[PDB]
C-alpha cells in the first residue's frame, strides 16, 4: 500500500526558494511511489474571505448570519461552496498534508490562512465535542514548511523575535492538533534571501534528505511544554 | 490636540457581539470627541491575497517577484494598490488602532490577516534599520479586541488551548510591537455565544467602560516574559 500526500503551497512566485521547496518535495515524494497533490492557492486564487457565498442552501437562521453555525450545517447538507469541498476531498484522502509557506507576521500568509478558516469546517475536521487527541482527522500528520526572513539566532529564546517554537503554537496546536492532526516536527528554512547560493542549495537538498525518510518519523508532543518549555 | 482612532473592524453580521463590540467603541470614543474612522473589511470586500497587483505601474524586477521586495519599493514610489494607501492614510493618522474580531484558529479571520500583509508594508510599518521600539509606527497604540469560541478556563496556562497570551504572541509581539506600536492589553471576551443575556451586557458594557479611561492607560510590556513567563 502506498501514501497519499496533499501539499497546500502559498507563494506568488515558482522561482522562489518555496516554489524549489514544493518542487523538491514533489520530486522526492513522487520518486517514493507516493500519490502527490498540490494546492497551489495564489494560482487557483483561492478564496480567503469567510462568507455567506460559503453556503449554497437555505440558510439556518438568514436574520443573524453566524459562519460557523452555516458552515457547520452546509457541510452536513453538502450545501458548501465547491471549491471548499474539493479540498476537503484533498484533505479526506492525503496520509500527509504539507503546507509549504513564507512566514508572514509570525504566521501564515492571508491565502493559507482562509484555506484553513474554510477548509477546516466543523463536522469535516473536529467536531464538539471530538476536537484535539479526538479531531475528526486524527490518523493523519501534518508538517509546516516554513520560510523566513529572520535568522535561526533572531528566533531563539534570547533573540529578538523569541524561541521559533513559540510562533508555531497557534497552527500546530491551535489548528492542526485542534483537528487531530499528528504534527511532524516542522521545517525551518531560515533567512533564505540572506543565504548563499550554496547555504540555500543545502537547504534545499535537507529538506529532500529528510523527505526520504518522513514514513519512519515520529510525531512531536504537541504540548505547551513542547513549544514552552518551562 | 484630539485623539484620532482607527477601528479594523473584521465580522460578517451587524448583529454580531462583535459588531456590538465595535458599536460600543464608535459611541463611547465619539462621545468623548474623538476621531473615529472604521474599516469594515468585509463590506470593504476587502481584498486579503497578497499579490503583484498590489503595485501599479513596471516592477522592480518582473521576472522574479518579490511581494517584499515590490511592495517595498512601490511604497517609496508611490505605486501600490489605492486601497492599501487608503489604509495607510487612516494608520497614519490614527493615535490609536482598535482590532475588533473574532479568535479565528488562535488568530486573526484572513480577511484582517491579509489587512496586515497588505497594509503593514516594509518602508511604511518597517524597515530594516526600523523595528520592534524602532518601528516606523512607533508612538501610536494598538489594542486587539478579540471574542473567543472557548471559555476562559479552556484558555489557561494547563487548559486545552493554553493561556490565551500564547496565542496573543505572533499579533502583539511579531506584528504590533515590531511596527513600532505600543500594545495596550488586550480585550478578551471570552464564550459569548455561550454566554447569557446578562453576561454579553457585562461584556460589551465593561469594554466601553474601559474605553472611557483608554487614554490613560499604560502599555504593557509586550515581551517574551509577559506572554509566556511568571
Ligand atoms: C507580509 C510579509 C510578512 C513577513 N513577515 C515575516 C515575519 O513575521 N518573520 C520573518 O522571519 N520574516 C517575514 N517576512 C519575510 C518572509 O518570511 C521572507 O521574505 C520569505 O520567507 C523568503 O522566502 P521566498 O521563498 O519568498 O524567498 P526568495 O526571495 O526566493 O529567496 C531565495 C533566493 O534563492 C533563490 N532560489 C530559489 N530556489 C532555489 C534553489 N533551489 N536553490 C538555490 N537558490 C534558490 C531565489 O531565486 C532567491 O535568490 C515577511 C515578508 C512579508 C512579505
Ligand atoms: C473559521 C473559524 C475558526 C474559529 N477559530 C476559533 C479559535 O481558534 N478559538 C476559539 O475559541 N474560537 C474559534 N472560533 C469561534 C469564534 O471565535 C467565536 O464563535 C466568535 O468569536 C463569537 O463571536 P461573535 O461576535 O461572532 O458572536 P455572536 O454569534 O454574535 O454571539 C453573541 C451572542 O450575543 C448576541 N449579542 C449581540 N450583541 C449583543 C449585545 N450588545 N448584548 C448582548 N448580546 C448581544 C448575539 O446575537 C449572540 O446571540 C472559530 C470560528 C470559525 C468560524
Ligand atoms: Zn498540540
Ligand atoms: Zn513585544
Given at each position: ?45 483561492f ?31 453538502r ?51 471530538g ?95 513542547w513549544?514552552?518549555?518551562?
Open positions: 500500500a502506498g501514501k497519499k500526500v496533499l501539499i497546500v503551497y502559498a507563494h506568488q512566485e515558482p522561482k522562489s526558494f518555496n516554489g524549489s521547496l514544493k518542487n523538491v518535495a514533489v520530486d522526492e515524494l513522487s520518486r517514493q511511489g507516493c500519490t502527490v497533490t498540490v494546492s497551489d492557492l495564489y494560482a487557483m486564487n478564496e480567503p474571505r469567510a462568507t455567506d457565498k460559503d453556503i449554497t442552501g437555505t440558510l439556518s437562521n438568514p436574520e443573524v448570519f453566524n459562519y460557523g453555525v452555516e458552515t457547520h450545517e452546509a457541510y452536513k447538507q450545501s458548501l461552496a465547491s471549491d471548499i469541498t474539493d479540498e476537503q476531498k484533498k484533505v479526506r484522502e492525503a496520509d500527509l498534508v504539507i503546507f509549504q509557506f513564507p512566514l508572514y507576521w509570525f504566521s501564515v500568509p492571508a491565502i493559507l490562512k482562509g484555506w484553513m478558516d474554510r477548509v477546516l469546517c466543523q463536522g469535516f475536521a473536529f467536531d464538539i465535542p476536537f484535539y487527541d479526538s479531531g475528526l482527522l486524527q490518523g493523519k500528520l501534518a508538517l509546516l514548511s516554513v520560510t523566513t526572513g529572520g535568522t535561526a539566532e533572531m528566533y531563539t529564546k534570547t533573540g529578538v523575535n523569541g524561541d521559533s517554537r513559540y510562533f508555531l503554537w497557534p497552527l500546530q496546536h491551535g489548528t492542526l492538533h485542534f483537528c487531530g492532526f499528528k504534527v511532524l516536527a516542522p521545517q525551518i528554512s531560515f533567512a533564505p534571501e540572506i543565504a548563499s547560493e550554496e547555504e540555500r542549495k543545502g537547504m534545499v537538498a535537507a529538506w529532500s534528505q529528510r523527505l526520504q525518510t518522513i514514513w519512519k518519523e515520529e510525531p512531536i508532543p504537541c504540548t505547551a511544554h513549544h514552552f518549555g518551562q
